Structure formats: structure tokens, C-alpha cells
């Protein structure tokens, strides 16, 4: 039970890392090339796209993945240099859990659960309101939901382990 949780967490971490590394970059290759808007004003596309996607999904996910692994690096380097251990273990576990929960909440509040095909853009220099068409909405939505589920499972396992330790 308690020992299994660590194995499950490690396997899930490896699985999510592999998924993000393999099927992450190529899906978002043509995000801006295929983004088009129904207007003739030069420079409307850039402003509308920037308003639509302030920070791409892949950037946020890669940053989260790199950030959640800092405690392991700190522990490994401390152990290597050594050659309050319980205090360090507790502190690192608590910090990892807090960071993961915060990142999950931020992700939920940033992107939501859908990527609508049509967007309304009304920023300078675009005149009045214009309509812009997104590329690949369905695949992006599926990937969003999948990543959210994986993160939720990770958070649940971490909370269970923390509760068990007490």
C-alpha cells in the first residue's frame, strides 16, 4: 500500500514526461503559421494571436515539469556533497506538494477545459471586432483534458502519501 504509492508516482512521472517529450512539440509546430483572421489590416494577425494565446500550453507544461523536479536534484546533490535528514525529507516533500497544487490551480484558471475554434479580437490596430479561426481545436482539447487528469492523479497520490506520513 504505502510502498506501492512511490512506484506508482514514479511510473506516472516517467509516463507524463515521455508523453510531453514525444507528442508535445510536433503538435504545436504550426500554431502561428496556420492562424488566420478575416481582415486586410496589416499586423492584425500578430496582435490577435498574441491576445489569443499569451503563453502556449507546451511552455507552461515544460516549466512545470522542470520545476517539480528541483527537490530531487537538491537532495541528490546534498547527498553527494555529504560523502536533519528527516527534516530535509519532510521539507522537500511538502514543498513539492505545494508547488504541484499551485501549478494545477494556475493551469485550471489559465486555460480552462476547451479551446474554441472561433475567437473575437478587438485590439489595436484591428478595426472594431474581427473573427479569427484557430487550428486543431479538438486535438488540443483532448491533450488538455489528458494532462489535467494526469496532474490530478499525481496530486491525489502525493496528498495520500502526505496524509499517511502525518
Backbone φ and ψ for 116, nearest 5 degrees, come out as -60, 145
User: 12 near 154, Cβ under 8 Å?
Assistant: yes
Minimum CB distance to its own copies, residue 138 (Å):
5
Give the nearer residue to its own copies in terms of CB position, either 58 or 94.
58
Which of 5, 137, 148, 157 forms a contact with its own copies (CB under 8 A)?
Answer: 137
Binding mask 83-112 for its own copies (x = CB under 8 A): ------------------------------
Distance CA 134, CA 45 (A): 12
Backbone φ and ψ for 126, nearest 5 degrees, come out as -60, 130
- If one asks whether residue 163 binds its own copies (CB under 8 A), the answer comes out as no
Region binding its own copies by CB under 8 A among candidate stretches 18-26, 96-104, 105-113, 150-158: 18-26
Which of 38, 83, 86, 163 forms a contact with its own copies (CB under 8 A)?
Answer: 38
- What DSSP assignment string belongs to 18-61? HHHHHHSTGGGTTTTTS-EES---TTHHHHHHHHH-SS-HHHHH
Full strand arrangement of the beta sheet holding 130-133: 36-37, 130-133, 118-121
Give the nearer residue to its own copies in terms of CB position, either 97 or 135.
135
Helix axes 137-165, 2-23, angle to 10 degrees: 160
Binding site for its own copies (CB under 8 A): 3, 6-8, 10-11, 14-15, 18-19, 22-23, 25-27, 30, 32, 34, 36, 38-43, 46-47, 50, 54-56, 59, 62-63, 66, 70, 73-74, 77-78, 81, 117, 125, 127-131, 133-139, 142
Amino acid at each position: 500500500s504505502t510502498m506501492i504509492g512511490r512506484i506508482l508516482l514514479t511510473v506516472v512521472v516517467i509516463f507524463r514526461i515521455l508523453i510531453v517529450a514525444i507528442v508535445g512539440e510536433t503538435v504545436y509546430d504550426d500554431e502561428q503559421t496556420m492562424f488566420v483572421c478575416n481582415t486586410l489590416q496589416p499586423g492584425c494577425n500578430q496582435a490577435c494571436y498574441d491576445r489569443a494565446f499569451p503563453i502556449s500550453h507546451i511552455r507552461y507544461w515544460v516549466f512545470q515539469i522542470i520545476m517539480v523536479c528541483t527537490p530531487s536534484l537538491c537532495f541528490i546533490t546534498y547527498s553527494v556533497h555529504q560523502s536533519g535528514i528527516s527534516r530535509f525529507y519532510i521539507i522537500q516533500v511538502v514543498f513539492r506538494n505545494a508547488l504541484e497544487i499551485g501549478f494545477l490551480v494556475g493551469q485550471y484558471f489559465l486555460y480552462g477545459f476547451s479551446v474554441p475554434g472561433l475567437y473575437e479580437c478587438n485590439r489595436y490596430p484591428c478595426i472594431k471586432e474581427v473573427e479569427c479561426y484557430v487550428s486543431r481545436p479538438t486535438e488540443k482539447t483532448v491533450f488538455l483534458v489528458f494532462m489535467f487528469a494526469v496532474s490530478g492523479i499525481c496530486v491525489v497520490l502525493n496528498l495520500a502519501e502526505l496524509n499517511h506520513l502525518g
